[PDB]
């Protein structure tokens, strides 16, 4: 519902945290063309040969997909070089971070932790076996470490989460200056259209909103990575549909191979071994246009979250439900299994109440308007106050400007104007 | 051209709306691999199943499909879940939206009507069908309703319209906070650089620029839909692509299949069925690979699509020609076939004149720098004024502010400073 | 490090130029699909028939992209249908842009001359073979020339530049509206949160920065354009995959074809080059799929340079790094062989000095609070100031508003606030 004669306007507000969670990589995977084909069988390497290079080309795009993983993983986190590390003190004004820090006590914060045990894990029994002993025993299907551990991918979250509690913004955009952290946010609120002794007066109930948001977390984290997970879920069916297929005979007598080489004449066994070629190579061609359709999907999350890391960490976005949803102060982001995950902490205007408002105000003639906020009535009185935190003042000339004249605006009301001069001249 | 001692200042405006339309989805269809290949045939079936489990593979690669066109839909339209209608008054302070609210006596705009008339929709002979019937009669190609129908959709644009013009963006970052229209668009103004005061002394101007702009929409999209045209026109090519390979023999004594069962011995039907599998297999994996990538291509412009709503239409972006050409100030969304119309608002700078410039004015020995807007000259006076909007104003000391001096600026001139003060205590 | 009473401000700054390079399209290119396959043979192309319609399917697809590289190159170029024209005074407040501009003695710039000598070069045969003639000679691989040529492209970037230099971005957003360099700088200073005179007091210094800046940019690029030599050495692969492959037998006596059409019985010939278009129909649409995939990457790519065009160069940008890293002023376009160069002109912070601070100061029983910027002291004195350059000025009523009083700020100080009225009246 609405009117053409009355407005709302907080008078209260509560502080938000929202979890935010992309994929940024998948395990990095590749196979061995010639040795899934052909497992270690002489006579069906010289077949395949004679079908040209399609084992280089399909080995170059699975290599490239292994390359862009790695690629993503250090766009997203490792863009800053430098290690920042926090102080002891760890007086931050009532804000209070030791869930989201590492524990002294792997180097990793509460959330995180709680994160890496949410995420399940073919790959499982590769790991076992641990690397062309592995290779040969999983028929060609091997895989390939990060060049980013856990370890220092975590580093660098670390030094990103020092940053941005020390120097705020500024290390992410020249040198780091420090900064009081109650004054820091003191101009993330200004960012979002609210003066600054709002937060000064309201420090204590900010930090406890603040610091209330943050539990929450943890009890809807343990109580949310289906994002994640499915990634996972999807490469793990990838992968078992190459398996399953090395037992398909596609026309032929068996899908051993060993029992083709045997028991047939050379000819004949020729002719099943170069079906069985046939179908194998198309199996692994379906399986390699499917990784770099889904490869390409998770590049572009890659790209959007190395975007988000530089837009909602290090600084402060105008874009509405880019950083989370309500007004956007700041991120803090956390790691993640082949992922990143953000916590977004907005403002949002709580309890509001109907005032009677009007377009401008007409006193000796002239037409005053307001140089910001609104003008407002209590239904006695008019004031001027912001716009996203009911704050009434007295309207005077040193809070309006003046343009044209009365009989021109058509919502204009009578009132008067306080100069804060003449009264104590006289 | 251009020269180092003058500023072109506009004097005028006018308001342009412009229309940018978006894809979201593509009709949800699918294909039953085995009643494709095999239709209605035992021993072809049991052919088919040798050759594992492409069928599966291929049948989950579609539905992902299916499943990824109601997401795409959702995110775009349902970001707003309470439902908003605008009130009978229908009083904006002049501004006329009857061609873009829904019409009481389906419930839609009258402009949404014309776009539902543009799009020309195989579809076709299966909706006249209507599932398993439909399925053999078209040979396993199937097709499948959204999740969110038209009207549903209707509802989600209603909402957010009455949102937008009741509450501004406010009901996009927390509760709704209703504001008068005319008010509304003041504060859009001083988003753009524009004081408010433009507003409200040409109210009457804009509202009949801005109510000549809607009819002008009607008369474009009436004599435009081919971004979305074309989606069905790709969609219809790559049905009936499916469909003629089913004719081809691709060495087969013939396509039919049935005259391969019969009239051949047992084996002999095996080997040209055998052939037709192959074929007709690859024939579908050619149709589902180009599915995928298309479908990726979809994907991308839904993401933008949900981009533009949250920063277009719940808000005011400040991105060069990303809610359209020139200032932004709105935004409404319509409903289409299979995608979503933006209606942007825009500020547009209409007839500038040529004055003469300078960086600086030396008063008492000091420099004088304006605190917003520019010096400029009319060959005679001085005067201080906003950029985007000629509207010259006397130069006082509440216009300027004083940093070093007359000796340093190199475009410095000499002018007097009008101090609001001391002439009215002498 | 940092504290909880003190704050580090930057004293000084310098100009930075950096350079981010795009990729916008690729080689137009497409496969004569019968050809290719049946090279001249009337039997392979009777035999070829029988298969359906996997040759128009396939010319379809390539088709498809050749026709985007030009709306991708259009896109992100041709934003701006005026031409304009720089004057020959070439003075621009000592900011020398000789090295951007085009060259009266091809019309092209310093810079744009380097980047078309660093990209290196199938594609070279073709253009010696200059067009069925070519076509039959190349077995069915041809190459397409673009709509828009490099002194096309050269003439939209000059007119970019020459509209940046002379109106800034008004010409991106309406008409143009010339004014003079120095003070189009002074907007963009405005725009980062930096007053006008620093500009204006420090011109000298701030051309001298940007003209070596400069300097350092034909040096980083004659000592850089991987990203778009491997689009070309990408495709280069993808062409010598088709032209080998032709030589594979794939279990045919011969690649040849002429050597099974003679010497073989009809039949018998039949069955050898069924086997053969088989082989190669399979090799083509791997081709095929890998192309539009990697097209469908250039697209996204030529999509973000177009944005940046937008956003950076016909404007000022709030995003964090996405028009380099520092504070955005502004962006320079060059052309570049198959893609887009943007020469980022971005502000940094030099040399911080630590100073104590305070939220806020206690004068008569009310806290006053800074309208813009910090209070820090100098050990004895406090002032207020710039938060990105140390300007310390005088703490007075017109630097500060009043909220609340001594008693609720926590980091509240005791010191005098000057009242710029009583003391000229006593
Ligand atoms: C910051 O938050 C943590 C987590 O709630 C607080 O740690 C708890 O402190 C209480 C009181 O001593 C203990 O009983 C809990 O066992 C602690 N929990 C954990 C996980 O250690 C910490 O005290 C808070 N610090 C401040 C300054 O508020
Ligand atoms: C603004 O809302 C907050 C709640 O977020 C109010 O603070 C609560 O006040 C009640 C008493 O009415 C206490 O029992 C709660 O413990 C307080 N919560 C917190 C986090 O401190 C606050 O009083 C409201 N202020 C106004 C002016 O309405
Ligand atoms: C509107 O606000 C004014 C100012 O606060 C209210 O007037 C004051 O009311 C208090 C009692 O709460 C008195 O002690 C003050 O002396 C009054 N000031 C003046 C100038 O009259 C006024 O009552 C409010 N109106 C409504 C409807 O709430
Ligand atoms: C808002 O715009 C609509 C559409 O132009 C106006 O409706 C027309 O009004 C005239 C005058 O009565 C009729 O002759 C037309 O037939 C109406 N057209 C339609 C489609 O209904 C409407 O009157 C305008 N309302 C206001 C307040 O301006
Ligand atoms: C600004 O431009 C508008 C046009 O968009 C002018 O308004 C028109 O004025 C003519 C008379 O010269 C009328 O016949 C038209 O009907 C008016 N159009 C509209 C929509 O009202 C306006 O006068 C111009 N103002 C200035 C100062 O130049
Ligand atoms: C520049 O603007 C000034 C102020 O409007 C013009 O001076 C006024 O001109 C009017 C006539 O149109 C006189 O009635 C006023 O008394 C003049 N005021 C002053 C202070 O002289 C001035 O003529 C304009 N100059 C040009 C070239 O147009
Ligand atoms: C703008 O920069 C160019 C490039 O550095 C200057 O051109 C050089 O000028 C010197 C001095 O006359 C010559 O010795 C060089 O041979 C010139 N180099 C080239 C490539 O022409 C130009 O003089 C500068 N102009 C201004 C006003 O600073
Ligand atoms: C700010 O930094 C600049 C360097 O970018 C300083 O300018 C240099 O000053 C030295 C003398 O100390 C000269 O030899 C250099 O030639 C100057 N460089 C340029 C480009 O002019 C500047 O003096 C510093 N200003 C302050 C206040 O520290
Ligand atoms: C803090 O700044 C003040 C103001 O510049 C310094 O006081 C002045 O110092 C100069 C000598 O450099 C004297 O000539 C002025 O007369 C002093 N002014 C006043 C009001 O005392 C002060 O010394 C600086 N403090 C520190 C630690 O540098
Ligand atoms: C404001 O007025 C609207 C319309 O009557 C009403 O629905 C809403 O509840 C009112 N809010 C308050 C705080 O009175
Ligand atoms: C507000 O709307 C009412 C009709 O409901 C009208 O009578 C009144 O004049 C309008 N007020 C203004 C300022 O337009
Ligand atoms: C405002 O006061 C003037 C007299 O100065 C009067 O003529 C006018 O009608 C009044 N307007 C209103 C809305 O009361
Ligand atoms: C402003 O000056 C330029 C350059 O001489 C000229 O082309 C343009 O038409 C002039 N505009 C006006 C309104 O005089
Ligand atoms: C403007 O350019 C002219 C040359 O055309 C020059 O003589 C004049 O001094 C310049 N003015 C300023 C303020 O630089
Ligand atoms: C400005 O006035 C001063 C005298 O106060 C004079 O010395 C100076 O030359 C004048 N500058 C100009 C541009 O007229
Ligand atoms: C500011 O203080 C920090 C912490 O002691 C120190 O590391 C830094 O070097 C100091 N900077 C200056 C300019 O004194
Ligand atoms: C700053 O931190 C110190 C502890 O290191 C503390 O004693 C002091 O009171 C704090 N100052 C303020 C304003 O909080
Ligand atoms: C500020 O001055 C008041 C007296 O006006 C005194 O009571 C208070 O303690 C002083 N505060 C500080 C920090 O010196």
């Not at 699975?62 to 390359?67: D, E, M, R």
């Not at 191979?257 to 002719?271: G, H, M, Q, Y």
Request: proline share 5%; with cysteine.
């Amino acid at each position: 519902a609405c009117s053409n004669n009355s407005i709302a306007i907080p008078t209260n507000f509560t502080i938000s945290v929202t979890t935010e969670i992309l994929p940024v990589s998948m395990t990095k995977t590749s196979v061995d063309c010639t040795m899934y084909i052909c497992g270690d069988s002489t006579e069906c390497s010289n077949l395949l040969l004679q079908y040209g290079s399609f084992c280089t080309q399909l080995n170059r795009a699975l290599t490239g997909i292994a390359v862009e993983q790695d690629k993503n993983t250090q766009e997203v986190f490792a863009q800053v070089k430098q290690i920042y590390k926090t102080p002891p003190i760890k007086d931050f004004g009532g804000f209070n971070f030791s869930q989201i820090l590492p524990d002294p006590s792997s180097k990793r914060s509460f959330i995180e932790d709680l994160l890496f045990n949410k995420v399940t894990l073919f790959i499982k029994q590769y790991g076992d076996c641990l690397d062309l002993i592995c290779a040969q025993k999983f028929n060609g299907l091997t895989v390939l470490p990060p060049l980013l551990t856990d370890e220092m991918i975590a580093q660098y979250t670390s030094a990103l989460l020092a940053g941005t509690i020390c120097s705020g913004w500024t290390f992410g955009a020249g040198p780091a200056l420090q900064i009081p952290f109650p004054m820091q946010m003191a101009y993330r609120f200004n960012g979002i259209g609210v003066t600054q002794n709002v937060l000064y007066e309201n420090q204590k109930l900010i930090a406890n909103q603040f610091n209330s948001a943050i539990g929450k977390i943890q009890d809807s984290l343990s109580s949310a990575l289906g994002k994640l997970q499915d990634v996972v879920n999807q490469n793990a069916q990838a992968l078992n549909f190459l398996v399953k297929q090395l037992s398909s005979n596609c026309g032929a007598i068996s899908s051993v191979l060993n029992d083709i080489l045997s028991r047939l004449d050379k000819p004949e066994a020729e002719v099943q071994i170069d079906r069985l070629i046939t179908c194998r190579l198309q199996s692994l061609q379906t399986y390699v246009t499917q990784q770099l359709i889904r490869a390409a999907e998770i590049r572009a999350s890659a790209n959007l979250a190395a975007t988000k890391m530089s837009e909602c960490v290090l600084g402060q976005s105008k874009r509405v439900d880019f950083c989370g949803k309500g007004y956007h102060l700041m991120s803090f982001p956390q790691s993640a299994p082949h992922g990143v995950v953000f916590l977004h902490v907005t403002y949002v205007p709580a309890q509001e109440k109907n005032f009677t408002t009007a377009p401008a105000i007409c006193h000796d003639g002239k037409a005053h308007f307001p140089r910001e906020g609104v003008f407002v009535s209590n239904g006695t009185h008019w004031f001027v106050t912001q716009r996203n935190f009911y704050e009434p003042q007295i309207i005077t000339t040193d809070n309006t400007f003046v343009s044209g004249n009365c009989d021109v605006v058509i919502g204009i009301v009578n009132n008067t104007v306080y100069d804060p001069l003449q009264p104590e001249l006289d």
